[PDB]
Amino acid sequence: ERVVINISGLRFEVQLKTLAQFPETLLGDPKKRMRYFDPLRNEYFFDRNRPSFDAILYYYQSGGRLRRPVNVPLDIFSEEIRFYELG
Amino acid sequence: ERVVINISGLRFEVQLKTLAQFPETLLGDPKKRMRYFDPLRNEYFFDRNRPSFDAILYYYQSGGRLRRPVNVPLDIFSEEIRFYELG
Amino acid sequence: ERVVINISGLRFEVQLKTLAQFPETLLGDPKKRMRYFDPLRNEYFFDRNRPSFDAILYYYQSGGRLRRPVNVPLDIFSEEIRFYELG
Amino acid sequence: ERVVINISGLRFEVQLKTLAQFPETLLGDPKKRMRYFDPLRNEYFFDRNRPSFDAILYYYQSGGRLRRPVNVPLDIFSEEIRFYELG
Known part of the structure; x- marks a missing residue:
């Protein structure tokens, strides 16, 4: 029911349903987010900026506030x- | 003596007595916080904004300072x- | 040679030597820091503000810059x- | 193919190729970063300031932006x- 998103070592835990609200986005589309899945650690890994991700995640959690x-x-x-x- | 509160992957540890000071709040009411409890992990889970939670915890730590x-x-x-x- | 300091769930890892440089402080004095030692998890635990502790720790790491x-x-x-x- | 960098307890994770871009830096030079490696913790440990490291990592991630x-x-x-x- 929840997945782990690891941003450069920083682990976030979010409900799949939360991500599913925006299906046209990277994290909202299983086919796009699967390119970043790490089958060995059962999490999605992104080699990106950590301080930005709180706000990216909040956009989903809040139902659209960016x-x-x-x-x-x-x-x-x-x-x-x-x-x-x-966008 | 200590409770784990997991805000979207970020874990906070706080004494139950400290939450208990404010029984009219979500975290200070056993009935309300039980809706967010996870028995397997023995922690409370909120799929919410991470940066905000330091100040929520400080409210309990400071004896009511918001x-x-x-x-x-x-x-x-x-x-x-x-x-x-x-409030 | 390293100790774990847990500030409300946030774990910091510091060389014992880093702390020992300022022996008059809480963390640099064995007798004062012993009051916050947890023998179950082998770490020091403080029920305090998280965002402040990076700066407190950096005072020791830098050799005195507060x-x-x-x-x-x-x-x-x-x-x-x-x-x-x-002080 | 990933490297774990532990800054005073805070763990960062980066692809080795990302650090390899800049071989004249500490983290991009195998000999230099080896002094900070911990075999029993398959990670590099620095007893240094935590808030600064997001920007050190972003230098590698961004292709050299400081x-x-x-x-x-x-x-x-x-x-x-x-x-x-x-520099």
């Missing part, structure tokens, strides 16, 4: 939003 | 305050 | 400095 | 840049 963390510059966060295919 | 962290926007923090029933 | 994390208000951080007996 | 995080003071960050041999 906010940039103060400590992540706009150009860096905008690249993460593009990578996670939230 | 302080918004500078990196958590006011509308987000106010929703977390209402969810955990700290 | 800086307040931008995300922790001055009154809260000053209370932590007193608790850890850094 | 960005001072907003809540890490310049003198502290500059010392970490020097220690990891990024």
Whole structure:
């Protein structure tokens, strides 16, 4: 019912249903997120910016609220939003 | 003597006596927090915003001080305050 | 040669020598830190603010540089400095 | 093919190829990083500032972009840049 998303060593735990709200995104589509699945550790691994992911995850948890963390510059966060295919 | 609270993968450890100071809150009421308990892991699980939780825990630690962290926007923090029933 | 310091669920790992450099403080004095030792998990446990502790630990690691994390208000951080007996 | 970097208890995970991009840095040089390796913990351990490391990692992830995080003071960050041999 929940999966583990490991962002450069930082492990997040989220419900599958939470991710399923946005099926056109990377994490919302099983076919896209499967490219980052690590079958040996039973988790999805992303070699990316850690401080951005709290906000990416919150976008799903909140049902659509996208906010940039103060400590992540706009150009860096905008690249993460593009990578996670939230537009 | 200690309880584990897992906020989307991030684990917090707090004495039950400290939560018990505020019985009208979610975490201070046995009936309410039981809805989020996981017997296998012996922890409470919330699929919620991570940055906000340091200030939620500080509310219990400080004996009732409610302080918004500078990196958590006011509308987000106010929703977390209402969810955990700290008002 | 290393000890584990658990601040409300957040585990820090520090060389004993790093702490020993300031023997008049809580963590640098064997008798003061012993009050917070947990023989079950072989770690020191503090029911305190998490965001402050990176800075407290960095005071030892850097050989004496004490800086307040931008995300922790001055009154809260000053209370932590007193608790850890850094003066 | 992954490397675990433990900064005072905080674990970071990166692909070895990512560090390998910059062979003249501490983490990109096998001989230099070997001094910090722990065979019994298959990880490299640094007793250093935690908040600075997200930005050290982002230098490798970004293909060489060096960005001072907003809540890490310049003198502290500059010392970490020097220690990891990024310049």
